[PDB]
Paper text:
A complete (180°) reconfiguration of the MACPF and membrane-binding P2 domains triggered by acidification then results in pore formation. We were able to construct a model of the pore fitted to its cryo-EM density guided by the distinctive features of each PFN2 domain and their connectivity and the conserved two glycans visible in both structures. We were unable to resolve the CTT domain due to the absence of density for the CTT in the PFN2 pore map, suggesting that it may have become intrinsically disordered on pore formation. Our structure confirms the rotation between the MACPF and P2 domains by 180° and reveals other conformational changes accompanying membrane insertion including the deployment of TMH1 and TMH2 to generate a 64-stranded β-barrel. In the pore form, the MACPF domain has rotated with respect to the P2 domain by ~180° when viewed from the side and by ~90° when viewed from above (looking down toward the membrane surface) compared to its position in the pre-pore, resulting in a compound screw rotation. The pore-forming oligomer structure is entirely consistent with the pores imaged directly on liposome membranes and is 206 Å in diameter and 140 Å tall from the top of the MACPF domain to the tip of the β-barrel. Side views of membrane-inserted pores were very different from those of pre-pores, with obvious transmembrane channels and standing significantly taller than the pre-pore form (110 Å compared to 85 Å). Upon exposure to a low pH shock, the PFN2 pre-pore rings began to form pores after 14 s and all ~70 being imaged transited to the pore state within 3 s. The resulting structures were higher (raised by ~4 nm) compared to the pre-pore state, in agreement with the pores imaged by negative-stain electron microscopy. Overall, these results show that acidic pH triggers pre-pore–to–pore transformation, which is achieved by a 180° rotation of the MACPF and P2 domains with respect to each other so that membrane insertion can occur.
Author numbering:
A (entry chain H): 216 to 265
B (entry chain I): 67 to 116
């Protein structure tokens, strides 16, 4: 009388988020013929769990 | 060991003051498992102005 059990379990996760923020300027004809401002911002987050 | 006996499935020599009654087998294997894995990511800013 022989027997056996197998019980595999496989649970995987992922949370791959992102951000991208940009600003701008460019007030330039009068009292200052030119000055320009722009910022950039990018953020990532990738978290896997198995 | 006078009338020297032997087990029925003759592969031993019991002494003649004992008798045998043959049977068995039994075993059992079992094991387990555990894994993991994690990750992460980044962020960035930049501004080039004037």
């Amino acid at each position: 009388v022989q027997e056996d059990h197998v019980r595999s379990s496989f649970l995987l996760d992922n949370q791959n988020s992102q951000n991208t923020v940009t600003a701008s300027a460019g007030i330039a004809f009068l009292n200052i013929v030119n000055f320009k401002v722009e910022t950039d911002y990018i953020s990532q987050t990738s978290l896997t769990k198995d | 060991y006078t009338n020297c006996k032997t087990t029925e499935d003759g592969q031993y020599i019991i002494p003649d003051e004992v008798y045998t009654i043959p049977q068995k087998e039994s075993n059992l294997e079992m094991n387990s498992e555990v894994l993991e894995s994690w990750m992460n990511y980044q962020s960035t800013t930049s501004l080039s102005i004037n």
